[PDB]
Amino acid sequence: SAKIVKPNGEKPDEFESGISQALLELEMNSDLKAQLRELNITAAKEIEVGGGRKAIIIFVPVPQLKSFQKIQVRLVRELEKKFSGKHVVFIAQRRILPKPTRKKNKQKRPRSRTLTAVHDAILEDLVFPSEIVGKRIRVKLDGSRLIKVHLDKAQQNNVEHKVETFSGVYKKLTGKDVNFEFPEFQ
């Protein structure tokens, strides 16, 4: 199988040729080759979400992430059309660096490579057509904390059915749980 668009660490292409092939007959399409041949993906997951629903996550290099962000809605529309019954999200590959403890000549860890910043950026990239307008993290009496994220109320018609997939994906690849709301206009 032609796997030309998937750079990796070195090796792993774990039967996820489906996304590469799908992009490959998203070749010869309408007005999408001016902005798709030069940029590619790193990895893809087919995690379980909610009930029997399935969502697929696509990991992208960061400058290539911004270049996906400019054309994401069209590509995700027909790629969901091909992969019927599943939801597609685009996430960067973010490279968290560990916190330096008291244990040769290491460099200063960038603030964007911290886990807090990475989780914030992941939450921002996960919901792309809508914009985050607030955060209402709440400690519920047990030491456990639930995050509540407010979306921009201008893409509610576009994205209101994916919120449980967003919650499942964010629980899967970050570990904490979120809810999504659409407040009245500010």
Partner 1 sequence: VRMNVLADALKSINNAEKRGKRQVLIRPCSKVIVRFLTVMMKHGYIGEFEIIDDHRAGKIVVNLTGRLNKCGVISPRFDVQLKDLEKWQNNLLPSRQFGFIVLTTSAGIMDHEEARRKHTGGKILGFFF
Partner 2 sequence: GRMHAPGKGLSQSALPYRRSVPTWLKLTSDDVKEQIYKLAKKGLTPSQIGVILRDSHGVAQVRFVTGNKILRILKSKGLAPDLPEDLYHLIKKAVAVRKHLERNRKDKDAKFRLILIESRIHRLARYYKTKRVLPPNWKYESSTASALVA
Partner 3 sequence: PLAKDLLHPSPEEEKRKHKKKRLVQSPNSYFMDVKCPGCYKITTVFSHAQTVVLCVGCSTVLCQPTGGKARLTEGCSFRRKQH
Build a one-symbol-per-residue string for 8-37: x at contacts with partner 2 by CB under 8 A, - elsewhere.
Answer: ------------------------------
At which residue do the structure tokens 């994401």 appear?
Answer: 72
Q: Is 134 in the site for partner 1 (CB under 8 A)?
A: yes
CA dist 96 and 4 (Å) reads: 27
Among 25, 31, 142, 184, binds partner 3 (CB under 8 A): 184
Amino acid at 120: D
CA dist 73 and 86 (Å) reads: 15
Among 14, 27, 38, 131, binds partner 2 (CB under 8 A): 131
CA dist 151 and 135 (Å) reads: 9
- Pairing relation of β-strands 54-60 and 86-92? parallel
Cβ neighbors of 50 (< 8 A, separation 6 or more) are 164, 165, 168
| Complex with partner 2: residue 66 or 138, whichever CB lies closer | 66
The single-letter DSSP state of residue 31 is: S
Look at the chain and count its residues.
Answer: 186
Taking CB under 8 A as the binding criterion, the range among 75-83, 91-99, 126-134, 158-166 that sits at the site for partner 2 is 126-134
Tokens coding 119: 């989780």
Build a one-symbol-per-residue string for 122-161: x at contacts with partner 3 by CB under 8 A, - elsewhere.
Answer: ------------x-x-------------------------
| Among 183, 176, 69, 52, residue whose Cα is nearest residue 125 | 69
Q: Is 133 in the site for partner 2 (CB under 8 A)?
A: yes
Q: Is 138 in the site for partner 1 (CB under 8 A)?
A: yes
Q: Is 73 in the site for partner 1 (CB under 8 A)?
A: no
Binding residues for partner 1, per CB under 8 A? 134-141, 143
Binding residues for partner 3, per CB under 8 A? 134, 136, 184-186
